[PDB]
Short mmCIF file of C-alpha atoms in Angstrom, two decimals:
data_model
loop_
_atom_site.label_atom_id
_atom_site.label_comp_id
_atom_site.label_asym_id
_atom_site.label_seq_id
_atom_site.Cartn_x
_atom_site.Cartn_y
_atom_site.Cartn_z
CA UNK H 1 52.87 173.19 92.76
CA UNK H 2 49.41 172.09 94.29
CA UNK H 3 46.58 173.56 95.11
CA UNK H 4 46.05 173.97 99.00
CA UNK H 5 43.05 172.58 100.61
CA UNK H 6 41.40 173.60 104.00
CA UNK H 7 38.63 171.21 105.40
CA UNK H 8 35.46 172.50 105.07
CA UNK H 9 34.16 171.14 108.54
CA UNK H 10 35.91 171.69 111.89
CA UNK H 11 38.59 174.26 110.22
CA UNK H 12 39.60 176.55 112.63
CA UNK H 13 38.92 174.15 115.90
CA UNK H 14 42.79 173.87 117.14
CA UNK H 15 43.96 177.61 116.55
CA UNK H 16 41.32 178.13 119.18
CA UNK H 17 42.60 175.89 121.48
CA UNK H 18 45.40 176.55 124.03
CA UNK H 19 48.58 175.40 123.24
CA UNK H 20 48.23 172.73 125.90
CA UNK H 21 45.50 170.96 124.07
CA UNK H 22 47.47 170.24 121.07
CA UNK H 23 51.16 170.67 121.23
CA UNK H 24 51.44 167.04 122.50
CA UNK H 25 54.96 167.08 122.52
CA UNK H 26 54.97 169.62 125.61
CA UNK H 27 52.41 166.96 127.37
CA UNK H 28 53.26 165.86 130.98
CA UNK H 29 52.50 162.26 131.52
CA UNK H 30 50.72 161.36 134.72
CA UNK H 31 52.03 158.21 135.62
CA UNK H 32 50.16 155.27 137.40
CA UNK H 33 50.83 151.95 139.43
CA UNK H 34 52.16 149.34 136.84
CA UNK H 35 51.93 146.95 139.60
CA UNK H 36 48.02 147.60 139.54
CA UNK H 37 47.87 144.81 136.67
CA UNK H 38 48.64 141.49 135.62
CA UNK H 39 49.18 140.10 132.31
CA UNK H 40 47.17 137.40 130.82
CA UNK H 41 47.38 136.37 127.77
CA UNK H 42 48.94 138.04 124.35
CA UNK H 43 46.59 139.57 122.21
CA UNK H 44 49.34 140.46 119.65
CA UNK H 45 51.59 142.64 118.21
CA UNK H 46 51.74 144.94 115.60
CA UNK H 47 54.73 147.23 114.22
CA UNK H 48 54.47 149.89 117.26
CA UNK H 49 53.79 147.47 120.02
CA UNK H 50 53.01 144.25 121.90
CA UNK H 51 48.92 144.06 123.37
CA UNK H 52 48.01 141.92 126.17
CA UNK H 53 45.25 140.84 128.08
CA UNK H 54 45.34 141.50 131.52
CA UNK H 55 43.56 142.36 134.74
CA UNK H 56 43.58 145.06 136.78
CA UNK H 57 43.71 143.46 140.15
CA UNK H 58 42.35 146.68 141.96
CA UNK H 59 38.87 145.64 140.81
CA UNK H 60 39.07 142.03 138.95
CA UNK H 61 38.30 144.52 135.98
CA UNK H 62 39.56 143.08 132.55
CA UNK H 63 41.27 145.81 130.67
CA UNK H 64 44.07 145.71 127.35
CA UNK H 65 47.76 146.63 127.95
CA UNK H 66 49.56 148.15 124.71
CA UNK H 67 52.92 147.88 125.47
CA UNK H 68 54.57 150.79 122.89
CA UNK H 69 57.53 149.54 121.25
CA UNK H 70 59.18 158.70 119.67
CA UNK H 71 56.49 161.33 120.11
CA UNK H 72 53.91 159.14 118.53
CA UNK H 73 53.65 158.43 122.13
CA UNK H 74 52.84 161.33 123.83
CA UNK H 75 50.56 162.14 120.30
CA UNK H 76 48.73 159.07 121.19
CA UNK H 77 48.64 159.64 124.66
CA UNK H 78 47.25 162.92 124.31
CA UNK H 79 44.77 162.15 121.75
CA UNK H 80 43.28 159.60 123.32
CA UNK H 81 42.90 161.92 126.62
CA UNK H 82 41.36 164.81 124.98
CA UNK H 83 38.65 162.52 123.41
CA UNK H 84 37.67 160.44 126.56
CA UNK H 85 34.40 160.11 126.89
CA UNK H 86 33.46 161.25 123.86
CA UNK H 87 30.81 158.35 122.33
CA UNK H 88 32.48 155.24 121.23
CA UNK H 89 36.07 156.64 121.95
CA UNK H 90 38.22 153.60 123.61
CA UNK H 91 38.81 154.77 126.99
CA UNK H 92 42.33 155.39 128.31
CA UNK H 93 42.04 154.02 131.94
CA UNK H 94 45.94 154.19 133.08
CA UNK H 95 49.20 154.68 131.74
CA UNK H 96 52.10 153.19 133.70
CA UNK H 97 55.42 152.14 132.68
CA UNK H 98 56.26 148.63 132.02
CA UNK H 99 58.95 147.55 133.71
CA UNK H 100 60.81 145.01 131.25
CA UNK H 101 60.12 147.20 128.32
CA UNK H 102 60.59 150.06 130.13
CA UNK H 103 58.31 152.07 128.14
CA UNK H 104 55.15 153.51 128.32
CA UNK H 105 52.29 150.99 128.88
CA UNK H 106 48.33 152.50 127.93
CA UNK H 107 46.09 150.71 129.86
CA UNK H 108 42.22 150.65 128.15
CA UNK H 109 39.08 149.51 129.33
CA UNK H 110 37.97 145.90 127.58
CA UNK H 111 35.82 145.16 124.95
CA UNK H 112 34.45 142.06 124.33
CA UNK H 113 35.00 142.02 120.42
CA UNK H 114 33.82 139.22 117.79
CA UNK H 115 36.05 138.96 114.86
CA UNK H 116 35.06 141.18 112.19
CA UNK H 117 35.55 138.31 109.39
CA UNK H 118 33.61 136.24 111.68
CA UNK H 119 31.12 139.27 111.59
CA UNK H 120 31.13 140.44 108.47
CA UNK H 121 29.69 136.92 107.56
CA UNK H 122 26.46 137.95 109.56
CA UNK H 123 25.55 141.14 109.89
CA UNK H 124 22.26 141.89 108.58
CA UNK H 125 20.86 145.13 107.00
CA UNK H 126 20.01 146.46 110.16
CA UNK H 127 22.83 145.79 111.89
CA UNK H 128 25.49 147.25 109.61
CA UNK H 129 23.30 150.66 109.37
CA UNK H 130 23.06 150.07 113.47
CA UNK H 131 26.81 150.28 114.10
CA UNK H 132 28.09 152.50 111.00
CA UNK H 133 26.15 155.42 112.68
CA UNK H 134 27.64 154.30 115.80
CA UNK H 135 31.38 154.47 114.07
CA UNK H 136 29.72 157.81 112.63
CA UNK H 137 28.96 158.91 116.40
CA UNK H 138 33.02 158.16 116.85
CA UNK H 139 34.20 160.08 113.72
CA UNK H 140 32.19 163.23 114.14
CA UNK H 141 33.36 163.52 117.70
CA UNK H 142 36.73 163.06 117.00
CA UNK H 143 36.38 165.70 114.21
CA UNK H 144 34.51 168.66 116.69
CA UNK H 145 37.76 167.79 118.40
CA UNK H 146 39.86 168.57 115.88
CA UNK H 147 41.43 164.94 115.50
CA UNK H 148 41.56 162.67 112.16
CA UNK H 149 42.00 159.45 112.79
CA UNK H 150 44.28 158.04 110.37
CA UNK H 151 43.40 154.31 110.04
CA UNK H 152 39.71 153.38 110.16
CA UNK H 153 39.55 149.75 109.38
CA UNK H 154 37.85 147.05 110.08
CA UNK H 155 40.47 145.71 113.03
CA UNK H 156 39.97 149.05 114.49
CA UNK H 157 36.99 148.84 115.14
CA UNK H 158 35.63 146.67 118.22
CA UNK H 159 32.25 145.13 119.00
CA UNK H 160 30.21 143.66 121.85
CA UNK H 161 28.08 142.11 119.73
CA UNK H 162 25.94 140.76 122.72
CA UNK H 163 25.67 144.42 124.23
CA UNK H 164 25.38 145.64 120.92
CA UNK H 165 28.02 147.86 121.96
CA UNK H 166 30.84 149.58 119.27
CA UNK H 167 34.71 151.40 120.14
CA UNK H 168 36.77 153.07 117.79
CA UNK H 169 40.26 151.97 118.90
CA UNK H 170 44.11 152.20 118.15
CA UNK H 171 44.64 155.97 117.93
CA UNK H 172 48.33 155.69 117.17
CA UNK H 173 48.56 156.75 113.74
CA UNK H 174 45.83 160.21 114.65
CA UNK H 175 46.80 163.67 114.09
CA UNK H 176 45.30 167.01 115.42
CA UNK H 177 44.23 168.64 112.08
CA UNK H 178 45.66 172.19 111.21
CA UNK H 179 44.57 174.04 108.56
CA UNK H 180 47.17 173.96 105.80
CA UNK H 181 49.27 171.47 107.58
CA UNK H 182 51.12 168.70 104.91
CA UNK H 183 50.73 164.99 106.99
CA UNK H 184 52.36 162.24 105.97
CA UNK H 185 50.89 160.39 103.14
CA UNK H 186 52.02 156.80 104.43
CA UNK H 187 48.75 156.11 106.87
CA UNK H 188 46.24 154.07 106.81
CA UNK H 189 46.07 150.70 106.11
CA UNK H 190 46.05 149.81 102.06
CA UNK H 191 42.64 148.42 101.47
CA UNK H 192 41.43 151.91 103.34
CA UNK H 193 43.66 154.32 102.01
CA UNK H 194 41.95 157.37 100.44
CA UNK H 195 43.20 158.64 96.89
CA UNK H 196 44.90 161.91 98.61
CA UNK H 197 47.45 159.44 99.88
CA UNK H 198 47.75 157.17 97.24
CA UNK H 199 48.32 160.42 94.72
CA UNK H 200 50.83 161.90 97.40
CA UNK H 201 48.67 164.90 98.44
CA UNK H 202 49.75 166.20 101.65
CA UNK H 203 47.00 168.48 103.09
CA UNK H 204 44.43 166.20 103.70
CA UNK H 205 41.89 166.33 106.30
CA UNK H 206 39.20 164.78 108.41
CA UNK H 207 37.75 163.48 105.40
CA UNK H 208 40.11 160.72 105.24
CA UNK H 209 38.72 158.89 107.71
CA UNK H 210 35.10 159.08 105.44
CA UNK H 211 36.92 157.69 102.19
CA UNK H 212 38.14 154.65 104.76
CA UNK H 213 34.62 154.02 106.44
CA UNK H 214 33.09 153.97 102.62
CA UNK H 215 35.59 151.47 101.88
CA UNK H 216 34.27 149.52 104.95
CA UNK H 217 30.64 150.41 103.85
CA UNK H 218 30.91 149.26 100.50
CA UNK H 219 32.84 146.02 101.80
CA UNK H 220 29.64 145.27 104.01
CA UNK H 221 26.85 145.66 101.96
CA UNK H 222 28.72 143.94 99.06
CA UNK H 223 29.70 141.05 100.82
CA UNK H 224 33.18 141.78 98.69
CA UNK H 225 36.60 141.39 100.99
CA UNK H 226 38.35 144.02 100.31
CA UNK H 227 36.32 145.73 98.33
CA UNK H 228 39.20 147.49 95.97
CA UNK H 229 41.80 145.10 96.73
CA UNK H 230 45.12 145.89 95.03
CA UNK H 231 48.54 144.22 94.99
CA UNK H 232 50.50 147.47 95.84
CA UNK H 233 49.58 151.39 96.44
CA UNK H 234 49.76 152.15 92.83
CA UNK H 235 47.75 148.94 91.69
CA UNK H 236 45.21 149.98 94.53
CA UNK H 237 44.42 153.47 93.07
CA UNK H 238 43.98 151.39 89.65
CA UNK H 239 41.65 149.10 91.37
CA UNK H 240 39.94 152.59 92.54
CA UNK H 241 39.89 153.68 89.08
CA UNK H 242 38.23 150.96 87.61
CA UNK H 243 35.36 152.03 89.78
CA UNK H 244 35.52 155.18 90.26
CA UNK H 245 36.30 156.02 86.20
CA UNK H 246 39.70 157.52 85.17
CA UNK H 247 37.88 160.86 83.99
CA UNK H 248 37.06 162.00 87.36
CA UNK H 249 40.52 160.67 88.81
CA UNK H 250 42.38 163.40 86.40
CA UNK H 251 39.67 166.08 87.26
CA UNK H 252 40.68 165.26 91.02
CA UNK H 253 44.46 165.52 90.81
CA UNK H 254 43.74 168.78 88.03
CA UNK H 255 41.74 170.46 90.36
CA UNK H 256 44.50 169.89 93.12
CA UNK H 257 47.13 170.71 90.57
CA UNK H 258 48.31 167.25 91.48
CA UNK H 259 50.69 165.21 89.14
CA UNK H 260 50.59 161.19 89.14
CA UNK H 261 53.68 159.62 89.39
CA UNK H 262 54.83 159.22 86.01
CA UNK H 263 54.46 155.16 86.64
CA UNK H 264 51.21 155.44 85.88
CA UNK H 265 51.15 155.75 82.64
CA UNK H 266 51.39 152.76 81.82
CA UNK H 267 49.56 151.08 84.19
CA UNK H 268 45.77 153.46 84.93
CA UNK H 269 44.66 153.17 81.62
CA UNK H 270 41.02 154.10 80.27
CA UNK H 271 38.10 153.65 82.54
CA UNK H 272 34.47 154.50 82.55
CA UNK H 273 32.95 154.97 85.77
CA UNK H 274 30.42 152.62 86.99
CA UNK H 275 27.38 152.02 88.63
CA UNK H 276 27.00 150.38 91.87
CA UNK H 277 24.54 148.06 90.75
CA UNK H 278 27.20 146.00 88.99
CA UNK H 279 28.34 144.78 92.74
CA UNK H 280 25.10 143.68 93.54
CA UNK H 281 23.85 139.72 93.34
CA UNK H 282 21.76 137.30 94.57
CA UNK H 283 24.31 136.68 97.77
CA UNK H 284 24.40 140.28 98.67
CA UNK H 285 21.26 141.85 97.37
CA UNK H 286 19.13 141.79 101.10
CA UNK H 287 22.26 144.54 102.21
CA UNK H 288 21.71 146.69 99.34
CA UNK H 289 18.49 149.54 98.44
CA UNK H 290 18.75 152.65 96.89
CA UNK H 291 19.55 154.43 100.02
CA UNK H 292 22.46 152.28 101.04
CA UNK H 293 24.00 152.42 97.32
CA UNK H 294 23.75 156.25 97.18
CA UNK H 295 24.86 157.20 100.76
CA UNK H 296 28.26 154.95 99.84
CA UNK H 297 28.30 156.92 96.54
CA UNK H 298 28.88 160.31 98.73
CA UNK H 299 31.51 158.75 100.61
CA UNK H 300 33.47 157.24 97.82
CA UNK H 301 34.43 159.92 96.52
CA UNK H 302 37.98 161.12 94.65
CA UNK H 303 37.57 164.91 95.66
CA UNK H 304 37.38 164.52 99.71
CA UNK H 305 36.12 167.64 99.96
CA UNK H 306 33.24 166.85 98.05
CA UNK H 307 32.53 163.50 100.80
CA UNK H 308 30.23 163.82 103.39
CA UNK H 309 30.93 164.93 106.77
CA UNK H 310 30.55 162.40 109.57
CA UNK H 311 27.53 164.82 110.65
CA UNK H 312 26.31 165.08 106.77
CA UNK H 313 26.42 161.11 106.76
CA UNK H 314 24.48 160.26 110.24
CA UNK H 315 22.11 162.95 108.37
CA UNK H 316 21.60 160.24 105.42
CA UNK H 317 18.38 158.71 104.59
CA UNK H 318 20.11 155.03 105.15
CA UNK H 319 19.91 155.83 108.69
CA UNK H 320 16.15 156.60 109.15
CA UNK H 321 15.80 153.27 110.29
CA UNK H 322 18.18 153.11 113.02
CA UNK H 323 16.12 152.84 116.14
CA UNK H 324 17.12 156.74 118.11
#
């Protein structure tokens, strides 16, 4: 069978934990006053729930209603209270119950976000060093905390461009992370999937979450929406390997012991790994120098346990020249 992994950050940081901290399923919620705030406007829905605007009437303060559409709840809920406060964690103000769904309702605090389409049409070089290490800042506390977040993406991600201000938000898909603990491979969102998932390798890792913010990196700096954008999960992993090479894909899933599915076959074919200076032209060359092009080459990696840590990453040269 395969070859167990272990991460080789943050290993061991649940088994010293009480229970309470993360058998979520045992979690009590504390319950506040649903009445405390009005809807506003719909934000919008996704497959789990229904987001609103709305205001929290006890204050005038403008805050976001999720409205869940079993146990992912309490997960969530208890996720997202264990990393409060931490720096650029969404804050969980209230949870109430909505009466007409009659299920739970998180309350967070609002950010004032600008489209990231809308923003990934102007971010300079400074700015997209700027706010990676600040989604960096998210990531590694997250990890000391024993949490993997699961879907790092651009829409999960939300800016006050004007305060120059970053949240990592929409915990719904995170896990705790256990040593030696198979997760389910269908997370994350396609474009951001890492190749454990897209080869079916259970015991992934924090390091998940650093495959997805390369994919965002490399996105960025290349001016290149998605960057490996594939039709299905299995074309995405070719799109991968047409990067990536096909030589180091098979000494990934041979060092794991992995097998592809046999559809592959006739599908992967032969590819040479390339360099990173084929992505780069006159429309996206002002985002791009050595140091950006070789801190996304030790994120983009097939073997995640040979990525950098969110700590190893904020420790990159590409970041010297984010004002501290």
């Amino acid at each position: 069978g395969p070859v167990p992994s272990r991460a080789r950050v943050y290993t061991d940081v649940n088994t010293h934990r009480p229970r309470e901290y993360w058998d979520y399923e045992s979690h009590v919620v504390e319950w506040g006053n649903q009445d405390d705030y009005q809807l506003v406007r719909k934000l919008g829905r996704g497959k789990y729930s229904e987001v609103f605007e709305a205001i929290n009437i006890t204050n005038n303060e403008k805050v976001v209603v999720k409205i869940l559409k079993k146990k992912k709840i309490k997960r969530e809920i208890k996720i997202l209270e264990n990393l409060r406060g931490g720096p650029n964690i969404i804050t969980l103000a209230d949870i109430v119950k909505d009466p007409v769904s009659r299920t739970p309702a998180l309350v967070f605090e609002h950010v004032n976000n600008t489209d990231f389409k809308q923003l990934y049409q102007t971010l300079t070089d400074y700015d997209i060093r700027f706010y990676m290490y600040e989604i960096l800042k998210a990531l590694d506390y997250a990890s000391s905390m024993g949490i993997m977040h699961r879907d790092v993406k651009p829409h999960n991600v939300m800016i006050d461009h004007e305060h120059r201000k970053l949240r990592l938000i929409d915990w719904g898909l995170a896990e705790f992370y256990h040593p030696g603990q198979e997760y389910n491979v269908r997370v994350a969102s396609r474009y951001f999937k890492g190749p454990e998932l897209l080869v079916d390798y259970q015991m992934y890792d924090y390091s998940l979450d650093m495959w997805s913010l390369g994919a965002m990196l490399a996105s960025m700096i290349f001016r290149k929406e998605p960057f490996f954008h594939g039709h299905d999960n299995y074309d995405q992993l070719v799109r991968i390997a047409k990067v990536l090479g096909t030589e180091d894909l098979y000494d990934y899933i041979d060092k794991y012991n992995i097998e592809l599915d046999p559809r592959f076959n006739d599908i992967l074919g032969r590819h040479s790994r390339k360099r990173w200076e084929r992505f780069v032209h006159s429309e996206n060359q002002h985002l791009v120098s050595p140091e950006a092009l070789d801190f996304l080459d030790k994120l983009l990696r097939y073997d995640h346990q040979s990525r950098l840590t969110a700590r190893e990453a904020m420790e990159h040269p590409y970041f010297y020249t984010v004002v501290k």
